Amino acid sequence: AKTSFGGLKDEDRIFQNIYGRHDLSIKGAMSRGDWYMTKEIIGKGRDWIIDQMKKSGLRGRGGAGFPSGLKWSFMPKASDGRPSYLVVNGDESEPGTCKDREIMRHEPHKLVEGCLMAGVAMGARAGYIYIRGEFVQERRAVERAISEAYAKGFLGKNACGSGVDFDLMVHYGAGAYICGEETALIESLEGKQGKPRLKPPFPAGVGLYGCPTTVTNVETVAVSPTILRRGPEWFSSFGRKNNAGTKLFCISGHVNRPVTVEEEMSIPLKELIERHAGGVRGGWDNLLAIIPGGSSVPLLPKKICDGVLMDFDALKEAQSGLGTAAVIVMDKSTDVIDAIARLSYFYKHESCGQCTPCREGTGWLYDIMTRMKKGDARLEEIDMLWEITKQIEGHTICALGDAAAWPVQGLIRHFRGEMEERIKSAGGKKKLAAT
Amino acid sequence: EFATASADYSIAMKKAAEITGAAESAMGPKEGGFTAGVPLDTFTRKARIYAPARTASQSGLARTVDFATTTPAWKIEFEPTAKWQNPLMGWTSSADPLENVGRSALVFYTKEEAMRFCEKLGWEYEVTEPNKRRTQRTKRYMQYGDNFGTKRAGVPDLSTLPSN
Amino acid sequence: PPSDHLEVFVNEQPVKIPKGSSVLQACDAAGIDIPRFCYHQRLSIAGNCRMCLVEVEKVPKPVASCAMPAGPGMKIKTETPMVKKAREGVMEFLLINHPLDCPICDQGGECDLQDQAMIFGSDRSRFVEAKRAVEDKNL
Amino acid sequence: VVPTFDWKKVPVPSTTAKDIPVTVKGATPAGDLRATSGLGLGDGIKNHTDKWLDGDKKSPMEYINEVAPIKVKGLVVASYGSDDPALGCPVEYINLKGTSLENPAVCKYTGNRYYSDDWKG
Amino acid sequence: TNSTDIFNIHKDTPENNAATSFEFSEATLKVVNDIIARYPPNYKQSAIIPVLDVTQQENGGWLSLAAMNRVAKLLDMAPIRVYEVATFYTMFNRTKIGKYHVQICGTTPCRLQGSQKIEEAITKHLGIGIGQTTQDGLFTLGEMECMGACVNAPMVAIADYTKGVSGFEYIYYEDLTPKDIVNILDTIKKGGKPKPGSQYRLKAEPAGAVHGGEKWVPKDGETTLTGAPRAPYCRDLNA
Amino acid sequence: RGEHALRRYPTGEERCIACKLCEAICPAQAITIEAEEREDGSRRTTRYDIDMTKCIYCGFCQEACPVDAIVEGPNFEFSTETREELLYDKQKLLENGDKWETEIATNLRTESLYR
Ligand SMILES: Cc1cc2nc3c(=O)[nH]c(=O)nc-3n(C[C@H](O)[C@H](O)[C@H](O)COP(=O)(O)O)c2cc1C
Ligand code: SF4
Ligand code: SF4
Ligand code: SF4
Ligand code: FES
Numbered sequence A: 001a002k003t004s005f006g007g008l009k010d011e012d013r014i015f016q017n018i019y020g021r022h023d024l025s026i027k028g029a030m031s032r033g034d035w036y037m038t039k040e041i042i043g044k045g046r047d048w049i050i051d052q053m054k055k056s057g058l059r060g061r062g063g064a065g066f067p068s069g070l071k072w073s074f075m076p077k078a079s080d081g082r083p084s085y086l087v088v089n090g091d092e093s094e095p096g097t098c099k100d101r102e103i104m105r106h107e108p109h110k111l112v113e114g115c116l117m118a119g120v121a122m123g124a125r126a127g128y129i130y131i132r133g134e135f136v137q138e139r140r141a142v143e144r145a146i147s148e149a150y151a152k153g154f155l156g157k158n159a160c161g162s163g164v165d166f167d168l169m170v171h172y173g174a175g176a177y178i179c180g181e182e183t184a185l186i187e188s189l190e191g192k193q194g195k196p197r198l199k200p201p202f203p204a205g206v207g208l209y210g211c212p213t214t215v216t217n218v219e220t221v222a223v224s225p226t227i228l229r230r231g232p233e234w235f236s237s238f239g240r241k242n243n244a245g246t247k248l249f250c251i252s253g254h255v256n257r258p259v260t261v262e263e264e265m266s267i268p269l270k271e272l273i274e275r276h277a278g279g280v281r282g283g284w285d286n287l288l289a290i291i292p293g294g295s296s297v298p299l300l301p302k303k304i305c306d307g308v309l310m311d312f313d314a315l316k317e318a319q320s321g322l323g324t325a326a327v328i329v330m331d332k333s334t335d336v337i338d339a340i341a342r343l344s345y346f347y348k349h350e351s352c353g354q355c356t357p358c359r360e361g362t363g364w365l366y367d368i369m370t371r372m373k374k375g376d377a378r379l380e381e382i383d384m385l386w387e388i389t390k391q392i393e394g395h396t397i398c399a400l401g402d403a404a405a406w407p408v409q410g411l412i413r414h415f416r417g418e419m420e421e422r423i424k425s426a427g428g429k430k431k432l433a434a435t
Numbered sequence B: 001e002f003a004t005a006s007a008d009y010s011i012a013m014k015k016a017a018e019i020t021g022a023a024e025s026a027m028g029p030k031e032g033g034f035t036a037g038v039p040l041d042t043f044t045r046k047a048r049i050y051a052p053a054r055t056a057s058q059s060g061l062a063r064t065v066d067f068a069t070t071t072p073a074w075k076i077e078f079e080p081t082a083k084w085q086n087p088l089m090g091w092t093s094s095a096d097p098l099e100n101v102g103r104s105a106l107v108f109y110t111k112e113e114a115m116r117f118c119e120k121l122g123w124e125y126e127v128t129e130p131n132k133r134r135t136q137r138t139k140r141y142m143q144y145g146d147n148f149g150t151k152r153a154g155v156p157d158l159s160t161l162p163s164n
Numbered sequence C: 001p002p003s004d005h006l007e008v009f010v011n012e013q014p015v016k017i018p019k020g021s022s023v024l025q026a027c028d029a030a031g032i033d034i035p036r037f038c039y040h041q042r043l044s045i046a047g048n049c050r051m052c053l054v055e056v057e058k059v060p061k062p063v064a065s066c067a068m069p070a071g072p073g074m075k076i077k078t079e080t081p082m083v084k085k086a087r088e089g090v091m092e093f094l095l096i097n098h099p100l101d102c103p104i105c106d107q108g109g110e111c112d113l114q115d116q117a118m119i120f121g122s123d124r125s126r127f128v129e130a131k132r133a134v135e136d137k138n139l
Numbered sequence D: 001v002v003p004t005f006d007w008k009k010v011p012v013p014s015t016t017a018k019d020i021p022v023t024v025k026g027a028t029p030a031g032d033l034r035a036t037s038g039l040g041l042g043d044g045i046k047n048h049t050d051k052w053l054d055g056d057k058k059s060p061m062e063y064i065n066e067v068a069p070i071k072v073k074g075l076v077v078a079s080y081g082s083d084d085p086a087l088g089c090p091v092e093y094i095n096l097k098g099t100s101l102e103n104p105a106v107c108k109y110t111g112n113r114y115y116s117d118d119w120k121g
Numbered sequence E: 001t002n003s004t005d006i007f008n009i010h011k012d013t014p015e016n017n018a019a020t021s022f023e024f025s026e027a028t029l030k031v032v033n034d035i036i037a038r039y040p041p042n043y044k045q046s047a048i049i050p051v052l053d054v055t056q057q058e059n060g061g062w063l064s065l066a067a068m069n070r071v072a073k074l075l076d077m078a079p080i081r082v083y084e085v086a087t088f089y090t091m092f093n094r095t096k097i098g099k100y101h102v103q104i105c106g107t108t109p110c111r112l113q114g115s116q117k118i119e120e121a122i123t124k125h126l127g128i129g130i131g132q133t134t135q136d137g138l139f140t141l142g143e144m145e146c147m148g149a150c151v152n153a154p155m156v157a158i159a160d161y162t163k164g165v166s167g168f169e170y171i172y173y174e175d176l177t178p179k180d181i182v183n184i185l186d187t188i189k190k191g192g193k194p195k196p197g198s199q200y201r202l203k204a205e206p207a208g209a210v211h212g213g214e215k216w217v218p219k220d221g222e223t224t225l226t227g228a229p230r231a232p233y234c235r236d237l238n239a
Numbered sequence F: 001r002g003e004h005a006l007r008r009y010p011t012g013e014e015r016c017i018a019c020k021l022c023e024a025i026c027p028a029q030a031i032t033i034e035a036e037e038r039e040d041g042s043r044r045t046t047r048y049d050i051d052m053t054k055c056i057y058c059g060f061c062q063e064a065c066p067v068d069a070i071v072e073g074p075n076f077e078f079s080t081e082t083r084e085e086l087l088y089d090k091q092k093l094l095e096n097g098d099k100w101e102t103e104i105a106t107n108l109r110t111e112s113l114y115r
């Protein structure tokens, strides 16, 4: 077994046109290997595709990391009276995350063929893609690919000459981050406000229009045809055990060369940033903190980052998470309290307001953080702030409340001394007026 | 196992009500009013034995017959007598001696205890059984998952799909 | 019938309930009256107030008892430290934006919020920020 | 099918219709239903202030009507009724958006009136 | 909720009241009826968000009460549901805006790259703050959350409402300095078309970065996918 | 704790808002209150009686009031010749407050540090 991970070859990258350098039409995609042997893969069977996706070790690229093969197997196998639906999540409103924009803009035929593969794998008759409403050109490119796939008979009745029927449609939102949640996405797709449902029931039991439904990420869907053609053993040869495969990483912030780049999983952060991105602005010793997985996961300081692998089972043990693998880098000129305060403002702004702890407490967290930025607080209010985050987390309907508690927990845990110094030194400009 | 309000002084109240010799005390009809020493026309009035229903303004159930074994909930009530206004101030005047004594002080665990008190005191009584709450929900919205079921508008027809 | 009444355990007491009943209905059949704000007997279930949170064995999170169905052999706990902490926290979130209006409010004396704050909530607040103000509506 | 109902042809007794207690502008729309109890009905008193004040004395409602609305910068105002918060009312947070000098917002404790020129208007 | 919309209730205006009329043209009605066919007939209400978006370009960048009532009658749903959807989502403007809607991202990955200096440059040039329209009716300044363009931070999106539904453009402008956004605004004001995307590279490929929000600093290094693209390939699916 | 009195704001509006807390706490039941809404929408009393021959002069009403409307002022010299002169209605209590307002405010400027 390999011990050192990283330095993925160009011949092993799935997304060979992530930069849009080549021809974007269906002839360019078909010459680059897309829509190849699709009828033969569909003719293998539903159970075969489920088994092949199970053996690959591919986990959910949406941010939770559930195994995709077992998730797709939750759909029913027989007929009861209701059709089944595939829904593909292309919201991508996570701060820092811009991989699905590239997949939808530059490689949409991989997404469309993966939609066909997943719909056949789950018995689904129709499919919907929920693209972000801010992504207008990405929606246009996806619709061009869908029209091209209809014109060659890849989608529809007798799809790819296989006998299975599958239709694909495009829906788009109107600017809500909460519509990335599964049941909230179903509720917005049904023609309502994007407010999540309580589980149970589960979307594979009762989903869109009361019918069995699976919601999957764009990057999860798009890598499936390459996995089926090149094999599950090829995909699982990358990364650690239970952490298989390749991953798109977005590196943003105080970095010399910000980049969306594909790489093997279980690569170190320092390797992933120094190569492929030109390193930290001002050297690695100018690093202050790094959020490794978007915005919903806690930050890490410089000591944890030097050594930790960008992996599901490695960031979690470092009291963080991989999430969407969106990397945000701050340097020593950053006011980290101000950065997490703007994150608190984001989570206040994006709360859907359905349940009591999220709706009332995200504004409270923002007010406390705004006072902490100026140092206009008390030292025990830090422990109060931790208690309030523990009151929100685990107590709400959906996981946006946990995603609102988690950055403040990481800020307190790794920079409590900075917060205490900000409180203490503010009295050098506030207690000179009291006397 | 047995645990029915087994952490308070009410354990020491349920027994001391079943002490032998004192748990079988009984009197004849109207006899307790003769020895009560109150005027005998008081027992010509009518009483009602009933358990009051839950208030519509609130959702709690503590003052109902649901917690009948835990808390005394049965009441004795009397009909109103004349009231008028005071000419000098406007305050409400009355000549009723039983104006608040049944609603403030007389509470019973069961219906039969209040009946026994009325029988030994000589009050003629009418008993009103409270209306029983129903717990089973409607067929629509029986569970939370029926909010999102196929009963909203039927199974969706797949006739507007591309390729029909 | 295939055992149309299923048995659950509420605070280690066996309770028989009809099938399709929620956790809150099982708590009600055990003689426990769970605090609630959005649940109603005559309405559809919403699950948004988070006041009915109880603890179920082998579940690491508090469940919303109004919406969660009751399974066979389920073990429900309504008086653990996490249930009481959940109740106090949800009440504190309910009261930060509420107006100090009890003298001029007509529900004062028969208010679910007042009585549930007195019984299942704390006695203090730590909130000193400005509240949300809303204009009134004509109906 | 389903013909409309004409509410204007519904008869109302003239004794009942001329005795509806309504409100001036204040804290409501002008002309909506004013809650009343039975006190003063035997003496034929339909007015709130006349039920306890006798004579041509200046009423408290006429005192508060002589204090002009107060211009406040912001979107929400906190009303205590005093400079010292211990000596006034419980704090009332009053919305100020959509308010002007002609249509100000009123405190439900004190009757003081506030408005703001900050809601892009 | 967005900027420019401080009310979640309807306020009567001479421009915006129940007496105001809205009706679709022929081509816009064709577009709306084509949108409706994507969904089942008994779940026709699924089409509300794209139809309301198309109505927003048709009406000129914002939704009026008459437009919302027309959409409610068209989809056979109660108007309060339409008001719920229109007030819930950020892109739906419910007050009258300018011809071009300038929206700047303010979330932390754009904030580290100096979005505040771009906001300062826009306010110094156009003379308006966030939530305001210019006196000429040309530009409306707004604030947005993360727009999914964080590797090309800091960025601005600009919406074009001068051509109706057929010529609607929602264009991202990325990797900006104060000079770049001033030039883009001047190009729009003069009648030209500024270049879309990043102002110093093509896409999210590795190149330099904006240093301090004021100067692009190019940097060389390892770039992937520089060779020939991969050939088609499939393993033997039999055994 | 002397003669009971009803207070105003500096504008001239009554502080009392008919919450009926002082009527509920009164152990002697010496307070009788009726209310409805005023013509400007305000919540104000139409009757506020204090039976001074039923009062025990405990001050519990002063403690229960959340807007400092009812007080016990510094007057102890209020003996009368008829008992009907000691059944105070709302108008006389407001007249007492208008008489004693400056002294009551001076007293409450010290006693607000403790209460
Ligand atoms: C607040 C919130 C926002 C989310 N946003 C996204 C998103 O933008 N894209 C996405 O794929 N999943 C998002 N998710 C996760 C989805 O709920 C779901 O778990 C995921 O899309 C399933 O895809 P998978 O195949 O990767 O498991 C979000 C979840 C939450 C709680
Ligand atoms: S946690 Fe926040 S976003 Fe999720 S349902 Fe509750 S209020 Fe809505
Ligand atoms: S001082 Fe005591 S007796 Fe007098 S009104 Fe107040 S509570 Fe009643
Ligand atoms: S005097 Fe004070 S306590 Fe008594 S009714 Fe008036 S406001 Fe309430
Ligand atoms: S009663 Fe409100 S969440 Fe269950």
Ligand code: FES
Pocket: A095, A096, A097, E105, E106, E107, E108, E109, E110, E111, E145, E146, E147, E148, E149, E150, E153, E155
């Ligand atoms: S933070 Fe600006 S595009 Fe994401």
